[PDB]
Amino acid sequence: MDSTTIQQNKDTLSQIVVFPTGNYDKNEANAMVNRLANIDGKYLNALKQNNLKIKLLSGKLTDEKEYAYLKGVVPKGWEGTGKTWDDVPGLGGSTVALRIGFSNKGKGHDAINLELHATAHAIDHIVLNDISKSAQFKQIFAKEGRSLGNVNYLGVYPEEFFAESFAYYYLNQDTNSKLKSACPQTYSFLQNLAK
Ligand SMILES: [Zn+2]
């Protein structure tokens, strides 16, 4: 309905997204920004205020200097697998690092969208001050925490279910209505947050 909002958010994101040195698909990198541009501007401006940089990567996560301490480190609940932090495409929290071309579900992650799920962690931690670990959201998580699948992951950690609910809410119209169907209280919760 509104293309003007996307364009203004893209300009906010221009003060947030940092493009990598090296070779990558420029069009796909731009597609990731367009998807991030659907997040409420209130959240984006607040990330801009706190100087949160969304770093897009052309290579592996642990190839980057700041995440080199993760090289060879096995993430939690990567029992066997054979994969370490070197094989993780995205990361969110205090910092945001995303590998370009790995947005879709299955590209080394179970999130419905890499960049929206990770940026959610930053908005949760930096902007909303760990709202996923608040009494109100815990009550909702207690009831709706498994309604998006991944019951041993999303259904166990409220910070993860928040991030995925956020991604469902802001990705596209289909996954938004999917969230409203499966998680009415969570949908209502996020809707009030942006009011
Ligand atoms: Zn996560």
From Swiss-Prot:
Factors inducing expression: Expression is controlled by a type I c-diGMP riboswitch; elevated levels of c-diGMP repress transcription of zmp1.
Statement: the UniProt record of this protein carries the keyword Zinc: yes
Catalytic activity: The enzyme catalyzes the hydrolytic cleavage of peptide bonds between two proline residues
Entry annotation: catalytic residues: 118
EC numbers on record: 3.4.24.89
Free-text comment about domains: The structure of Zmp1 is similar to anthrax lethal factor (LF) metalloprotease domain IV. The S-loop of Zmp1 undergoes large motions upon substrate binding and seems to exhibit a function analogous to that of LF domain III, thus contributing to sequence specificity and substrate binding. An aliphatic-aromatic network and the diverting loop contribute to Pro-Pro specificity.
Organism name: Clostridioides difficile (strain 630) (Peptoclostridium difficile)
Gene name in the database record: zmp1
Family per similarity comment: Belongs to the peptidase M34 family. Pro-Pro endopeptidase subfamily.
Cofactor annotation remark: Binds 1 zinc ion per subunit.
Subcellular localization(s) per the UniProt record: Secreted
Protein name: Pro-Pro endopeptidase
Gene3D superfamilies: Collagenase (Catalytic Domain)
InterPro entries: Anthrax_toxin_lethal/edema_N/C, ATLF-like_dom, MetalloPept_cat_dom_sf
Alphabetized GO MF terms: metal ion binding; metallopeptidase activity
Keyword Methyltransferase attributed: no
Disruption phenotype: Cells lacking this gene retain CD630_28310 on the cell surface, show higher affinity for collagen type I with attenuated virulence in a hamster model of infection.
Activity control: Is inhibited by the chelating agent o-phenanthroline in vitro.
Mutagenesis / variant outcome for changing residue 121 to A: Not able to bind zinc. Highly reduced activity on fibronectin. Loss of activity on fibrinogen
GO CC, one annotated term: extracellular region
Residues flagged as site, Interacts with substrate peptide: 110, 117
